[PDB]
């Protein structure tokens, strides 16, 4: 009832946008940068923010306390860094403190829906080359 030292800190990144989720024993609440998930910046993609709790159920999130700190990337990249780090934090929390029999039966739901929830996207960028505007496009050439 008053036991300390039960906390995990699992990050999740996408396109140079890192989000670190700090999960702790407590009443069920999730906050990102000290703000509720529902009050998120790109409100049109807010369903992506709150879908991991939709599939997993609010009962599983009822015994946790998540606070996320984010920096880097853009709006979309920070959104994916949020949903990835949230889904990672409690599944690693379950692995640390409860049996992994429960971890496996929530992990298979996460991977069957969206594997990016628990596996980072490796693609970052590509360097620009000295003959065109970008990485692969080349400057227009003329013959006459």
């Amino acid at each position: 009832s008053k036991g300390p030292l039960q906390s995990v800190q699992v990050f999740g990144r996408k396109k140079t946008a890192t989000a670190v989720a700090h999960c702790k024993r407590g009443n069920g609440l999730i906050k990102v940068n000290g703000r509720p998930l529902e009050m998120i910046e790109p409100r049109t993609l807010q369903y992506k923010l709150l879908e991991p709790v939709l599939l997993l159920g609010k009962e599983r999130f009822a015994g946790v306390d998540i606070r996320v700190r984010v920096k880097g990337g853009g709006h979309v990249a920070q959104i994916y860094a949020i949903r990835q780090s949230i889904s990672k934090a409690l599944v690693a929390y379950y692995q640390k403190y409860v049996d992994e029999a429960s971890k496996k039966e929530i992990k298979d739901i996460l991977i069957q829906y969206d594997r990016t929830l628990l596996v980072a996207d490796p693609r970052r960028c590509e360097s620009k080359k000295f003959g065109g505007p970008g990485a692969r496009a080349r400057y227009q050439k003329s013959y006459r």
């Binding site: 790109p42 049109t44 993609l45 369903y47 939709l54 979309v76």
Partner: protein, 189 residues
């Protein structure tokens, strides 16, 4: 139950033709809340088949330079267009979407280079993947040029384009284009 856009359950929609059954991705396995993901569906051949069809439409709609990266903007356009079609007809926005895709896909085409020395326009039959590609492209272009120089918005023109292709009444741009492709195919079978 998947609640696409928070509503519009995907368990009631069906695909009538087996040719396009395993190329549209509305079923519960490919059912997602939003048509927005980093799915890497163009990584290799035959991966876009399991990409959700609503995500395919919201990807093929950002076109013509000024709007090519604005996926959040295209998703909100799909939001309003889906609201309009549901309001106008009363059926599932996915059911009319699948209905328009099937009727807009040209079932036959012509290779146009069947005789390279002098063009022959040899007839040819299309693949199911080419069907969904051409149908989505035709519908997106019809919605694009319908609301180019008039008061009506993109979401509304996409809405009437979808319903017109869903029935087929010679006023959908995709329907006219498909009928033209079939017509020239019949001319040079």
């Amino acid at each position: 139950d998947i609640k696409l856009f928070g509503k519009w359950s995907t368990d009631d929609v069906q695909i009538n033709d087996i040719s396009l059954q395993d190329y549209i991705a509305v079923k519960e396995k490919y059912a997602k809340y939003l048509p927005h993901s980093a799915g890497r569906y163009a990584a290799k051949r035959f991966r876009k088949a399991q990409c959700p069809i609503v995500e395919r439409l919201t990807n093929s709609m950002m076109m013509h330079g000024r709007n090519n990266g604005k996926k959040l903007m295209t998703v909100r356009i799909v939001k309003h267009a889906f609201e309009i079609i549901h309001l106008l007809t009363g059926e599932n926005p996915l059911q009319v979407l699948v209905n328009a895709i099937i009727n807009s896909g040209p079932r036959e085409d012509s290779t146009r280079i069947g005789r390279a020395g002098t063009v022959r326009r040899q007839a040819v039959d299309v693949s199911p993947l080419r069907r969904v590609n051409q149908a989505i492209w035709l519908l997106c272009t019809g919605a694009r040029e319908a609301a180019f120089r008039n008061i009506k918005t993109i979401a509304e023109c996409l809405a009437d384009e979808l319903i017109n292709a869903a029935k087929g009444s010679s006023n959908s741009y995709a329907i006219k284009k498909k009928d033209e492709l079939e017509r020239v195919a019949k001319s040079n079978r």
